[PDB]
Amino acid sequence: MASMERFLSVYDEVQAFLLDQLQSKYEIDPNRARYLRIMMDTTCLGGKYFRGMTVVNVAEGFLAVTQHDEATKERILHDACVGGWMIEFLQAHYLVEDDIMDGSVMRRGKPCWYRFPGVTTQCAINDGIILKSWTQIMAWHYFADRPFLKDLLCLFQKVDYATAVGQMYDVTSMCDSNKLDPEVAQPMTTDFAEFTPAIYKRIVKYKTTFYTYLLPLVMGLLVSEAAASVEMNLVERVAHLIGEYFQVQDDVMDCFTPPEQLGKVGTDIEDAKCSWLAVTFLGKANAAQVAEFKANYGEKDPAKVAVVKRLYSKANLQADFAAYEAEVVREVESLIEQLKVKSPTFAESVAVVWEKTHKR
Amino acid sequence: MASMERFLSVYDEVQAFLLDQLQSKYEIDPNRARYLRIMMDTTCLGGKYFRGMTVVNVAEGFLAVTQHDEATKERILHDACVGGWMIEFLQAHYLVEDDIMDGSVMRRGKPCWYRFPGVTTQCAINDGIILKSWTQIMAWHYFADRPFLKDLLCLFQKVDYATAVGQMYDVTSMCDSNKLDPEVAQPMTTDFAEFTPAIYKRIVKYKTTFYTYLLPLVMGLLVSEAAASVEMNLVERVAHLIGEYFQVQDDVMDCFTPPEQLGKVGTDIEDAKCSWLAVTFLGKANAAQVAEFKANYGEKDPAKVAVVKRLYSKANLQADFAAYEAEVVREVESLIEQLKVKSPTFAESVAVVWEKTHKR
Numbered sequence A, B: 001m002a003s004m005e006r007f008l009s010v011y012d013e014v015q016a017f018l019l020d021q022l023q024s025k026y027e028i029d030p031n032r033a034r035y036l037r038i039m040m041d042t043t044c045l046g047g048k049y050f051r052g053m054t055v056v057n058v059a060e061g062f063l064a065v066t067q068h069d070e071a072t073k074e075r076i077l078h079d080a081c082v083g084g085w086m087i088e089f090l091q092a093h094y095l096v097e098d099d100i101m102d103g104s105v106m107r108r109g110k111p112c113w114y115r116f117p118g119v120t121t122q123c124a125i126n127d128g129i130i131l132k133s134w135t136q137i138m139a140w141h142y143f144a145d146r147p148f149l150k151d152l153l154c155l156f157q158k159v160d161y162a163t164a165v166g167q168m169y170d171v172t173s174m175c176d177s178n179k180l181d182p183e184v185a186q187p188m189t190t191d192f193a194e195f196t197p198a199i200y201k202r203i204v205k206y207k208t209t210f211y212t213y214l215l216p217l218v219m220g221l222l223v224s225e226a227a228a229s230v231e232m233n234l235v236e237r238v239a240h241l242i243g244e245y246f247q248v249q250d251d252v253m254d255c256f257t258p259p260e261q262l263g264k265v266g267t268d269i270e271d272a273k274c275s276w277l278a279v280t281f282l283g284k285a286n287a288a289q290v291a292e293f294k295a296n297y298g299e300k301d302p303a304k305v306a307v308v309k310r311l312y313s314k315a316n317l318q319a320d321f322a323a324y325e326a327e328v329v330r331e332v333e334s335l336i337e338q339l340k341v342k343s344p345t346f347a348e349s350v351a352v353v354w355e356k357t358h359k360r
């Protein structure tokens, strides 16, 4: 059976499980079960299932080189699917709540969940809570007796927390650190002294790379009982490296990809985000360009946003991007080679992960 | 050492642990560590610590009748404290997010967290995420090798989910079920046909009783390794019974307790909540009174809110409250007696739980 069909069937099975449990143990009525079904579908489905399918891919890699009974192969693939869904549901939680937090309008060419007429923020916040609780319900049901349950739960928990910490880094990235204070309304930075490579890297490492690259890879190793084919330090290093690149690509697209291709109107400039474009621009600008950036960034006025974009185009950030890209290629290739020592298979899964990221 | 001082010291220790970990493993800077310290203090502290101290109380009960080395007594009490804090932090998560969801103004005589000037909703949603993630960080650190870890995590997870389901029941309680639809803005009920005892009981069972009464009791049994001194069905039954009563008391206070005593301006009437007062009123009203209720409930206009309150006073709901109270006394007493069969000690902890609830 093809991987994607297996993964999508397991979605149906897990949905059915979750909703039947709600009826049998949580006293739910049909109409609220329907609302939850529709929320699950709207918030978990319609992406490329990169995260979840990486779990499946890593597990299939190991199946090709490990002796097992057929029933065990099926069990391992079922567990990889269920694990993949845990990650997709965790993403769903974060996108729901992030869209509310940011006051976002669209996501992947549809209204943000909270914007749906019969949803509202009051319900959507809670819906996103439930989305993450469902990851744990999945795990405890499908993996109750599994030898990797402890490790899987403890890793999930660490990634989830890393992610929330990353969110805090992101939403606070246009404040001056020394001015953080719950008691005082936070002004936007005037000096942009915290728009540095090191600070950018910390935001992205936590906000995105743990759940998007580390967790899928390591959960594939966990359901495969294969964590000893790898040096975990290398898996981390490669995950953080590819995940940074992913986020740089996303930063570039927010500014330059037409909205109907992007699936939204990018607002990083108006939101004063610490984006790769801003940090790279500030690293090569002259004094006059820096002043012009400060006078126009983080402002809703479309004239000012057009001034920031022009500053970026004139600064030939495309060539800094090509150079960053090259260096990442080098380093990813290096890490793949080091991974081949202990596991050719796992190194190949990481190559596939890289290829998929490098072309989007 | 007195229980409360032990509990408050363990808060300090757990805070220090969490914030030191953020510096050592999550690359946090001092100013963001300070923001998190202040958020933890503002959102977890200043209540009566009923939930957390019930864990400690149940565990002390067992210590008085169980042979142990001193070091073991300390360990058990430390674990009860840490478990108590997990519950207090879980409450904190739910109050932060609930206050945002509801657009609330105050809570326990201070502004809701999201209303703090240097917080905002954008940060507060995430802060409440972190508050719940911290429960898991506590558990995995302090209970890593403990024999009750699995059971504790699986129970925590079930309560958390019950709670989110309860929130969904609550926020949807003034809608007609058959009209739930993400695509359609939800009108308030006109018939109030879902303002019934059975429906009220379902809201409150899930929204409050699992985290406020069930979890504290059962976590005390878990850290005591005492789950075999009880019949768990009875613990559930008593938890749900006392927790319902707690919520009825809270419903009555929202309407009738002066705001400076309440710690907020009660808005259940304007919010069209399915409160005990509304359900009891509808169960004894005549046709004209029902019509007057419908024409005035769920409306911000203070004149209409005064009309609902007058309808409640004239309906002598105080006497329905005395009658409900009596029946709960009967049933709680009955359950305490059944609990004494297997455990006098645990039955006494449940009596103390009842006494504390019955007088507030």
Ligand SMILES: CC(CO)(CO)NC(=O)Nc1ccccc1
Binding pocket: A196, A197, A198, A200, A201, A241, A244, A276, A279, A280, A324, A327, A328, A331
């Ligand atoms: C060293 C490496 C590979 O190039 C992997 O950590 N990343 C960077 O160089 N990131 C960076 C981010 C923002 C601005 C400038 C640089």
Ligand SMILES: CC(CO)(CO)NC(=O)Nc1ccccc1
Binding pocket: A046, A047, A048, A050, A108, A246, A356, A357, A360
């Ligand atoms: C279309 C989009 C854009 O973010 C949103 O659904 N998804 C992806 O591009 N996912 C993806 C992630 C890593 C590597 C390859 C693909």
Ligand SMILES: CC(CO)(CO)NC(=O)Nc1ccccc1
Binding pocket: B196, B197, B198, B200, B201, B241, B244, B276, B279, B280, B324, B327, B328, B331
């Ligand atoms: C039976 C009992 C004890 O009295 C325990 O479940 N609860 C009730 O009677 N709850 C109730 C709630 C709202 C309105 C009317 C009744």
Ligand SMILES: CC(CO)(CO)NC(=O)Nc1ccccc1
Binding pocket: B046, B047, B048, B050, B108, B246, B356, B357, B360
């Ligand atoms: C003052 C207040 C009012 O809700 C809010 O902090 N706390 C309590 O009354 N807690 C409590 C819970 C159960 C039994 C006894 C006390």
Ligand SMILES: [Zn+2]
Binding pocket: A098, A099, A101, A102, A170
């Ligand atoms: Zn965001």
Ligand SMILES: [Zn+2]
Binding pocket: A250, A251, A254
């Ligand atoms: Zn972006």
Ligand SMILES: [Zn+2]
Binding pocket: B098, B099, B101, B102, B170
């Ligand atoms: Zn609420």
Ligand SMILES: [Zn+2]
Binding pocket: B250, B251, B254
């Ligand atoms: Zn209330």
